[PDB]
């Protein structure tokens, strides 16, 4: 998501 197609998680929170 966002500028790219990558989504990630940090401490259980999904972020772009």
């Amino acid at each position, epitope marked *: 998501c966002g500028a790219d197609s990558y989504e990630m998680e940090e*401490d*259980g*929170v999904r972020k772009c």
Partner: antibody, heavy 116, light 108 residues
Framework: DVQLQESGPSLVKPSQSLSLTCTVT?????????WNWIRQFPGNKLEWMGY???????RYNPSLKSRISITRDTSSNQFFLQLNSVTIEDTATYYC?????????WGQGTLVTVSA | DILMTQSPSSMSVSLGDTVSITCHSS??????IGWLQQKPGKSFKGLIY???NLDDEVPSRFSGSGSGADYSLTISSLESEDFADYYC?????????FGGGTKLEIKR
């Protein structure tokens, strides 16, 4: 879904500690997500206070860091807010909240008045 | 801290209207924005995450778009339940911060 509920005192005296419990049902707090406290001030301004993760890692708002602790009891599936050295300015409605895919699940909120 | 500028502060609109609410951040937030609804009775609900994605059971009336520092929430064909306060939130940077809110009221 997840259901959350705040409990704790409605009135805290200045200089003392604000302590709130969030009881989580329908989902284990060790499974996923971050488990947050957010507050809303009398004029509708929202502030993020901090979270504890599913893995027990905590993040705090730098404005509160020295004054705050967020903890958990995994046996009771509860997490807790402690805010110390409180002033009248800490009067707000306190919410416990799940952050995962945004902020889907919110408790009903509980009003805490700080006054002498 | 990242400042979220939400517009407008208030709206007087009718049922069936399509309305847009905007949020500008003080820096690029890479779509890390949510939209929240608080109805009468003070209950909050997450509606949108990553600028556009719907949370569970949120009707398709609600949509989102934007990039960089400029985002929108659109509510098509307003229904009675949709009249509430709305808030943006960024989770791109700690501390997470919120817009000032938008109050949707019924024209009469």
């Amino acid at each position: 879904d997840v259901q959350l509920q705040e409990s704790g005192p409605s009135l805290v005296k200045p200089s003392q500690s604000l302590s709130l419990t969030c009881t989580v049902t329908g989902y284990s707090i060790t499974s996923d997500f971050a488990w947050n406290w957010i507050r809303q001030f009398p004029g509708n301004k929202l502030e993020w206070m901090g979270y504890i993760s599913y893995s027990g890692n905590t993040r705090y708002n730098p404005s509160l860091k020295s004054r705050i602790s967020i903890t958990r009891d995994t046996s009771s599936n509860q997490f807790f807010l402690q805010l110390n050295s409180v002033t009248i300015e800490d009067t707000a409605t306190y919410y416990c909240v799940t952050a995962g895919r945004g902020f889907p699940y919110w408790g009903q909120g509980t009003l805490v008045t700080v006054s002498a | 801290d990242i400042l979220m500028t939400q517009s407008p502060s208030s709206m007087s609109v009718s049922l069936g209207d399509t309305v847009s609410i905007t949020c500008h951040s003080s820096q690029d937030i890479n779509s890390n924005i949510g939209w929240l609804q608080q109805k009468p009775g003070k209950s909050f609900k997450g509606l949108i995450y990553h600028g556009t994605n719907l949370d569970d059971e949120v009707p398709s009336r609600f949509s989102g778009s934007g990039s960089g520092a400029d985002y929108s929430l659109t509510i098509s064909s307003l229904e009675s339940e949709d009249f509430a306060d709305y808030y943006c939130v960024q989770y791109a940077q700690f501390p997470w911060t919120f817009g000032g809110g938008t109050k949707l009221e019924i024209k009469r």
